[PDB]
């Protein structure tokens, strides 16, 4: 509808450059298809993948325009505060085209009381039929959240997040022109994304398989102490 301005196009290009840059080591994708299928193997694979996703999330975030101008402690607080929500959005993207990854998730020590509601959430995200540009912008928007815990200069984060929201609103009009409520529906899903921060945290208190440990990076970012 309303076209992206030239500077908005440039911002989108930087975000898409960064979103498509890093991925998962093929050694890890080899394990998803070939490795033994047991709760123990699944726990180790899935936490290895989640650790890699945090590393990719950090690299993505560092290339968001303006992020490296923010206060350094605020940078850390934004990354840690968004890791789970960004993982949910990525999970949604993957599962809304590997059923083998789903089957491993379902035999990983995680209760069906958690998995079933979360996959229903991923499906509710899939019904929005988002493009990769929309997934990328929504991910950048959740990372640059001015209301996250521990942020000292919230106005500085807000001035980075506001232009992303403007671009996303235009993408919704461009990609789903026959559904003028699309952007509002995306933002409604953002709100429920936040409620699953707590569920994930509550799930972690009981997720254990053969008394295995989470990796050091996951212990940091998921607060497993």
């Amino acid at each position: 509808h309303m076209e992206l301005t030239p500077d908005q196009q440039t911002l989108l290009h930087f975000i898409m450059d960064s979103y498509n840059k890093q991925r998962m080591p093929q050694e890890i994708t080899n394990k998803i298809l070939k490795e033994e299928f047991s709760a123990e193997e699944n726990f180790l694979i899935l936490t290895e993948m989640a650790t890699n996703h945090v590393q990719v999330l950090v690299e993505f975030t560092k290339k968001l325009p303006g992020f490296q101008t923010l206060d350094h402690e605020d940078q850390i607080a934004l990354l840690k505060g968004s890791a789970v929500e960004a993982m949910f959005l990525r999970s949604a993207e993957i599962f809304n085209k590997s059923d083998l990854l789903e089957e491993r998730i379902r035999n990983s020590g995680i209760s069906d009381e958690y998995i079933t509601p979360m996959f229903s959430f991923y499906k509710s995200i899939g019904e929005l039929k988002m493009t990769q540009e929309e997934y990328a912008l929504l991910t950048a928007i959740v990372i640059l959240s001015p209301d996250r815990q521990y942020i000292k200069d919230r106005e500085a984060v807000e001035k980075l997040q506001e232009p992303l929201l403007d671009v996303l609103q235009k993408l919704c009009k461009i990609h789903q022109p026959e559904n003028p409520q699309h952007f509002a529906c995306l933002l409604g899903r953002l709100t429920e994304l936040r409620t699953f921060n707590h569920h994930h945290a509550e799930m972690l208190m009981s997720w254990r398989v053969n008394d295995h440990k989470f990796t050091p990076l996951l212990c940091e970012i998921w607060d497993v102490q």
């Binding site: 950090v58 850390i76 840690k80 990076l217 940091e220 970012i221």
Partner: peptide, 13 residues
Amino acid sequence: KENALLRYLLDKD
């Protein structure tokens, strides 16, 4: 330091 690995990754080029 709190979140030592996260800091390492953020500062590493």
